[PDB]
Amino acid sequence: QFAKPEDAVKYRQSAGTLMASHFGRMTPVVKGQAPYDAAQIKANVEVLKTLSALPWAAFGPGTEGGDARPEIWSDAASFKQKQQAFQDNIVKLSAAADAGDLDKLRAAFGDVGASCKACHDAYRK
């Protein structure tokens, strides 16, 4: 969907920015610093679920560029492994949010965040 590779760069950056907002805005809730409203969290995690699927096509074949580490494309299968792990952790977070239990939310939130970090540690400068 990208006329030039730089359009893929801008897309994936914007997807990451939105994911950070929808993930990180829950930090006070998972720490107990803000109240837990199950319906609020369920709706927000649905948004995050949608967003969470978006970057990866824009890191696929022919999207070389930007400031990411080049192993995304030279080791594309390894990048996909990190993606799979992340997307599976997102499913667990959706299940926690759908269940309406703060304990499950806390655990799944940590699972997701560690998975974001694992990919960044390998591929983000």
Q: Measured from the CB of residue 77, what is the shortest distance to a copy of itself in angstroms?
A: 25
Residue 81 touches which member of a copy of itself, ligand O=N[O-], ligand HEC, none, C-beta under 5-8 Å by kind? ligand O=N[O-]
Residue 84 touches which member of ligand HEC, ligand O=N[O-], a copy of itself, none, C-beta under 5-8 Å by kind? ligand O=N[O-]
Neighbours of 24 (CB within 10 A): 11
Region near a copy of itself per CB under 8 A, out of 7-15, 60-68, 73-81, 101-109: 7-15
Cα–Cα distances (Å) from 107 to 14, 33, 79, 93, 121, in that order, read 27, 16, 24, 8, 21
Closest Cα to residue 59, out of 116, 45, 67?
67
